[PDB]
Design a protein around this ligand. Sequence first.
Ligand SMILES: [Ca+2]
Ligand SMILES: [Ca+2]
Ligand SMILES: [Zn+2]
Ligand SMILES: [Zn+2]
Lengths: 384, 381
Amino acid sequence: RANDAPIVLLHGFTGWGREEMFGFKYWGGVRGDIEQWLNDNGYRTYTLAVGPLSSNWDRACEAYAQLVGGTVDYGAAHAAKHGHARFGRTYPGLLPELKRGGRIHIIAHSQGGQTARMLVSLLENGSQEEREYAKAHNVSLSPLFEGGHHFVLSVTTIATPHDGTTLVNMVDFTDRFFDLQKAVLEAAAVASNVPYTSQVYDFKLDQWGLRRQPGESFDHYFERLKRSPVWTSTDTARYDLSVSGAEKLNQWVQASPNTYYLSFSTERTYRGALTGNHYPELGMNAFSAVVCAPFLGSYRNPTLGIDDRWLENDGIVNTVSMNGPKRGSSDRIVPYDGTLKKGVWNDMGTYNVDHLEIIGVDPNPSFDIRAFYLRLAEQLASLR
Amino acid sequence: DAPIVLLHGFTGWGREEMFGFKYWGGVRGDIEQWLNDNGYRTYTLAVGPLSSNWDRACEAYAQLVGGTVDYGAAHAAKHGHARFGRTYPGLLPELKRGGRIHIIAHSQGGQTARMLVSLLENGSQEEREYAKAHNVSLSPLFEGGHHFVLSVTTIATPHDGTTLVNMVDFTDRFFDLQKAVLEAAAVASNVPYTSQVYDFKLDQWGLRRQPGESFDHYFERLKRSPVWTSTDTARYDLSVSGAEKLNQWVQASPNTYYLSFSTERTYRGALTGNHYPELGMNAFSAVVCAPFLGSYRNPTLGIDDRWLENDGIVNTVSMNGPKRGSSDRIVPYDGTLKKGVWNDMGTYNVDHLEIIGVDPNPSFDIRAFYLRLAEQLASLR
Ligand SMILES: [Ca+2]
Ligand SMILES: [Ca+2]
Ligand SMILES: [Zn+2]
Ligand SMILES: [Zn+2]
């Protein structure tokens, strides 16, 4: 121990706030509540809750405002390009002292990892698209695009598609993605064919002008979300989750030399005897084992360099993708030797735990979830 | 300030259940949400609807302070169900060490909230003696000298029982009520649901709805089960003679403020004295219950004309405070809340289900009723 910085949890393409999903936690699922375990052991922990289906850009902006307070500013240039509100919601700020000079650790799961890397990237460097635009059109700029804000001491990514996931290429992907979404609903005891009055699981699509209406089931809403810009356009989680889009992301989102990056990879498959294809183990969450993993560990594509190294998977994301960014990237990934190195991806290795088990959404009695996150917190509680 | 704790009666369910249709607010919205947004620390219990006040008190205790539910070795030995129940994390563990709550209970809730105070305050000697005799642990609930309640508020509670239990076709009609309350949340009693929807919380009895089993079919099994056929049921405590037996040992503590809201939705016939439901009474009570409630006499039981004014569910005279087998004192509201007695807050022109929003009533300002009560309860902290 000798940094005191809070931990900040960050979900992926599925995820909600503490008040949401009737208290059923993204971080902990059926195992309990990970934020609470940490706080009770004296690691101060806060939870971010951004647009699950939105782009990493949108989510970083949302994430910044949630962190220091204010209205979400997606950028005038960006807003004009993609045709959506410049301005979002207002947040009181979890840590407004961070302007004056605190520090955070981000712990991020799934696509959260991409959004954490880009939050840090934008914090340090800004965007010269938004800078040039603002002076061109004589409007204001969110401090997020100025640069010189260095306040993230660590990004820890867990089961993140740094190079993408190959699931995106699946033939029925659009439909099966929203079935994943409905599965995670069921996991939380929430049904998709009933008009919940309460918002329950808010997708936070204020920018796009999309909300679930009174008397609208999730099935219906998702059926509308499929035909919408949040599934259709460039500016989406779907896009940044494909192998090509992660590629574009990687090309501009580099590791801050002032941040400690950590990666945890996941696996819940075994190699074939005569092939190299991967197959889901007994105990992989039902939805992934049936719908997703067969494709994930058989899909080969010589054009995109998708060979045997991509087949091992955690039921959702190709395991090789979680090391750190590689495709389109300059960053350096090193195996964990004992001392966590700065400005580089410290590969903490691979765990026999599926995309939903590591967060607790699917059970795994063999995997001690509490010990994994408490072990992590203490690694993070060592310093610069 | 003291947090506020909402407690349902012989029907009720936690916030996640009934697809988010709230027992406390029904069609009118979310009473607990209203109390939090107006800045009253407010929580919601979901104990077993059909279970006895003893059981549901033991559960409420564990939901509050944390732990695994212990029904008492003597109690369990005596009725033939599991001693230990669900393990809860706890809403307000601070109650063991300094804290305080305001209980607001509806319908049978008010029996439960009182039996919860009496147990905290004086324990149970029976369990205490049984523990010496059989080498078993005792729950803190049965020790005595815990006194963290502060206020109990009963809205429409059958403190002297309801006369409805005496109905000839009660078993079948009670569960029809249960399934009308299902229908008010847009839940169907014939749909073979897979989601839990409404957990009757009968672990101790070893009873559970089977997936793909309708409430129709489940409720048939429940009627033939010990949570309907035993002495240890909501049904027996709901009885006039079961309430009396409760009242004989569940006193009012000097250390707590009790508040009673009575409720009426009937008009008196000029000749007979019988009572008939007002227009706009929830259709089910109007048809199925109030005519009986309004006409049922039995002078062995002491069921006078006095008993005929009703809620639709409960007899109005049963609601101001325990009396049959009670020494609890009952004063009508003099402007200032007295301690260790029932403060009778009057009678309101609202159904048993309307008073919690499960059935419409435009002329009833339900949001203003409960906000008002909150202050009254905060005139204390
Ligand atoms: Ca599993
Ligand atoms: Ca009505
Ligand atoms: Zn955008
Ligand atoms: Zn019992």
